Design a binder for these strands. Sequence first.
RNA 1: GAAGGGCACCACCAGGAGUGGAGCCUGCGGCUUAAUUUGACUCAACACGGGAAACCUCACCCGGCCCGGACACGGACAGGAUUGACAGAUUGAUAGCUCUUUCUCGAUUCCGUGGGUGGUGGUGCAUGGCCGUUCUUAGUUGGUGGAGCGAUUUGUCUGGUUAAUU
RNA 2: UAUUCCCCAUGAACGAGGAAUUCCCAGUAAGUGCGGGUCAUAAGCUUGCGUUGAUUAAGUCCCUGCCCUUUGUACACACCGCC
Lengths: 98, 71, 124, 104, 52
Amino acid sequence: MLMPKKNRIAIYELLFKEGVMVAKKDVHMPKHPELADKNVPNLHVMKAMQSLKSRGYVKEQFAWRHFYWYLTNEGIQYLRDYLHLPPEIVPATLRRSR
Amino acid sequence: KKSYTTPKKNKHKRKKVKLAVLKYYKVDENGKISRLRRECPSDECGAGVFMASHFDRHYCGKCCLTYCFNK
Amino acid sequence: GGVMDVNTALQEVLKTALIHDGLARGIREAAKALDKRQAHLCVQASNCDEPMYVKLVEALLAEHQINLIKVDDNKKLGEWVGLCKIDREGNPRKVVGCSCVVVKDYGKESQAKDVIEEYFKCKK
Amino acid sequence: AIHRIRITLTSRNVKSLEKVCADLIRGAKEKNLKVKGPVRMPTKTLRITTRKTPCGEGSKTWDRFQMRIPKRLIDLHSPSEIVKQITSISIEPGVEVEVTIADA
Amino acid sequence: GFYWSHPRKFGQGSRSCRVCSNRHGLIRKYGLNMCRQCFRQYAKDIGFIKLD
RNA sequence: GAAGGGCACCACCAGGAGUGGAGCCUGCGGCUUAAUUUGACUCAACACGGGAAACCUCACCCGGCCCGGACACGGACAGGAUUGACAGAUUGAUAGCUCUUUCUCGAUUCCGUGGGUGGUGGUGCAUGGCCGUUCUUAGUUGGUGGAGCGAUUUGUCUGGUUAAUU
RNA sequence: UAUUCCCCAUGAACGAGGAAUUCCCAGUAAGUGCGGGUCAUAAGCUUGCGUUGAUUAAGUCCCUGCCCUUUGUACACACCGCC
């Protein structure tokens, strides 16, 4: 609910599409593998996700300068209600196992 | 270390002006809108794009904020 | 849930157009939306000082690309669009007056969009 | 089919490279064809020499960080069975295996 | 999103440690790009073993 | 500045090589300098911090821009919160960073409060690791005995030996 | 604010270093380039590498500093002490 709308609305829906979103700690990328419709490097990603953790709707690791953004079960609500997404939703961890 | 004296000219952090902005819109009798002043040449700023009198400046604000000239 | 109460049929279309990113939301973008096919649906304010501003709306609205509604009061006219950051749990959120938006790209379909745009085009 | 196959065995661990290297000889000679045994290239010594000290000081002592990488290679002539048998068996530790088609 | 501009293309502007983003005593050789300390941490794991 | 034993060319002898003299290099000291950021002070500080630096580095000064103020908590529906502005005054800058004009993204914005977030800021006498070294010197320790009420002590040693309680 | 290099051109002190002091015994000292590291640019830096390759000690504790033993010690912030 913030920043460049086009870019950041896409970052949410990327993260909802995926189980896990890796990154790199580097402001000067103008891109990020998968998504990056346009620019949206670290910054627009970080600025979003380092928001998400501190309020609580995502959880971290860091590990050799990168940011290990893992999606929290509470965030499931925060971001799908942000994205009006269906009440089944199924983010990514549908996970057919055995 | 030093303790900063600062030459007494404490530079202004400035407001971008208050401005209601959109009152000056000539509604001649019934519903119809068009005034005249100076114009910009841009595409997202399509023909309606609008200009001025300052201590010089004039600017055009409609490829969101992308594109103010030099006048 | 979501069966359209009183003045909440415009609210879901405004809340889904808000979030679908495309609201020509004011005298300016409203008129530059009504100048093109960029316009679609709208919510004008009954109360309006110098009603030239409501007239510019009405006059454009009434052309081909037919729009309208009415909605009484300036002081209500926003909180069924997008305009609050959660700060404070009981929502006392914000508080000046409100006026004429232009709802573009509805939201997706259904919910309130078969209610209001079947009922407006054919008020019978 | 019969084509001029080269198998290039590159690894760090000499012992865990020459158990594999022997198994390709003994794997091919089982189903005999040809060979020209394991070739021994010069071993490349990846030699780095950094200061022991983080930060400045102390009498200047450095370490002598080394990694070896011995390459064996084995020529052969076979079909697309004997290659895909002998390569997929005798894998496992930190051992890289190349497979040249023929000649170049 | 504009301005943050130079040669970040050569010079230690560009290159930094992959582990910790410090920008001195850098093991350029051999496509490592570790700081010289970040060797002795991430060294055995790499493969450089101290022999003689 | 006790005594026996033993040992090291960071000791000497016997030398050569130098080194210490010159110019030059760059290391530091100082002065000077707005600035010559700075750590490192006998040895085990001084081409050492991998410390060969135009710009980056870089922190530091003379400026000057930029905000990247997370987060929440508050404040901001619309006579559009100011998201983001192509010619000139300028400014260094085509920095809307600012003095009118205004034309768009459009629920972002902005202003408080608490709180951060960094910081090549501080403190290596607040610490981890890593390093340096006393010190590639021969040393250190325990079980059982034996000695001491017991700290302790022998084992762990006169001598020959040995690079080395070997 | 000679970047680095070349091409010209000027063309210095030094004719073996005053008081001191480190380095080491065999492929050793020395010279000698050469790689590596440092690098866009680039090394008078180090770390390796051969190559050419000597003289001399092969012992002693005479100086400096280390090990043990015995001993003395008012030192135990340990003689850079204590007084």
